[PDB]
Design a protein around this ligand. Structure first.
Ligand SMILES: N[C@@H](CCCC(=O)N[C@@H](CS)C(=O)N[C@H](C(=O)O)C(C(F)(F)F)C(F)(F)F)C(=O)O
Ligand SMILES: [Fe+3]
Length: 329
């Protein structure tokens, strides 16, 4: 057997209010989790995740092959050269089981100055036809803002945890410019499940996706209640329990950089499970030009021998690197 990872449940509701001592006690919990396995469940988060899952299911189960080509990213459809990030990521039956739909900041509109400049990592979202998917675009865009609000609160907790003022990260996480993304991932039940779509870890575990660190500041994840994630600890890979009422939170490698690995980006992987399920990450990304000076909360003077890295450089290089390491998703 594999041991269960320590993934505490943290009531994050004080991070939405004005009781400062209560916020500090939440920050301590975040600090402890960040120093241990690197994962926790945010509870009392205020998001209607059941409705999120229902609206996502209705989308995934009704979208047609024709629509998928029409929304496809460049990796699947050469006609769509502007779609590097946003759009549909197709399955390849017999070979690749997972499929997904990614969207970015709704404020990245044709008139947005970064869209006008064609700055890397900024794209205008693509959507299915409203008559085929009534309400879907509006639901999805509202979800973006609901999970942006939770993420802002969580970033206040991380800042406090690190000995900073609560706006330390959140001041770089702004509606008009965030590079954050939502991905609506569908993992299918398949009978038979093709072996080509199953990877095998060095330890023999069957996987849907190999070990990695997240490309994010933090990742704010809703999943179905089907156990699948594993985190590498000093005691080996451990199973992260599912909890479809909470959000699973972890740091990404930008946090690791900024904190000189005080808050590591935990290495994790996705086990193969033959189940129809959802994985709905929000990758908390800053603005293209956001730069935070790296520091070290284990050093008396707080100084780090890491150099400042802009978030846009981090992100563009990280997303390419992850594709090269673990394959196009
Ligand atoms: N396209 C997004 C970035 C996606 C980066 C990415 O591929 N991340 C991985 C690891 S967190 C990811 O999304 N993995 C998924 C998972 O962990 O369930 C799935 C998949 F990508 F298919 F959705 C899988 F594991 F299968 F790769 C963006 O532009 O912001
Ligand atoms: Fe991940």
């Amino acid at each position: 057997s594999v041991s269960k990872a320590n993934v505490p449940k943290i009531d994050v509701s004080p991070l939405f209010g004005d009781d400062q001592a209560a916020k500090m006690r939440v920050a301590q919990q975040i600090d402890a989790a960040s120093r241990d396995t690197g994962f926790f469940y945010a509870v009392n988060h205020g998001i209607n995740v059941q409705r999120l899952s229902q609206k996502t299911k209705e989308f995934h189960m009704s979208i047609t092959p024709e629509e998928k080509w029409d929304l496809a990213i460049r990796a699947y459809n050469k006609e769509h050269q502007d779609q590097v990030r946003a759009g549909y990521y197709l399955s390849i039956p017999g070979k690749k089981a997972v499929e997904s739909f990614c969207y970015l900041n709704p404020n990245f509109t044709p008139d947005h100055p970064r869209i006008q400049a064609k700055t890397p990592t900024h794209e205008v979202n693509v959507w299915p036809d409203e008559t085929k998917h009534p309400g879907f675009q509006d639901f999805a865009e509202q979800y973006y803002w609901d999970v942006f609000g939770l993420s802002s609160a969580l970033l206040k907790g991380y800042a406090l945890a690190l000995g900073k003022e609560e706006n330390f990260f959140a001041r770089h996480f702004k509606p008009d410019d965030t590079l954050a993304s939502v991905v609506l991932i569908r993992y299918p039940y398949l009978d038979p499940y093709p072996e080509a779509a199953i990877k095998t870890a060095a330890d023999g575990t069957k996987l849907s996706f190999e070990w990695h660190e997240d490309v994010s500041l933090i990742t704010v994840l809703y999943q179905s209640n089907v156990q699948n994630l594993q985190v590498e600890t000093a005691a080996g890979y451990q199973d992260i329990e599912a909890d479809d009422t909470g959000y699973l939170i972890n740091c990404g490698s930008y946090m690791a950089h900024l904190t000189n690995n005080y808050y590591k980006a935990p290495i994790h992987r996705v086990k193969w499970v033959n189940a129809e399920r959802q994985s709905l990450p929000f990758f908390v990304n800053l603005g293209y030009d956001s730069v935070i000076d790296p520091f070290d909360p284990r050093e008396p003077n707080g100084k780090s021998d890491r150099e400042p890295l802009s978030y846009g450089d981090y992100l563009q290089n990280g997303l390419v690197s992850l594709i090269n390491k673990n394959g196009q998703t």
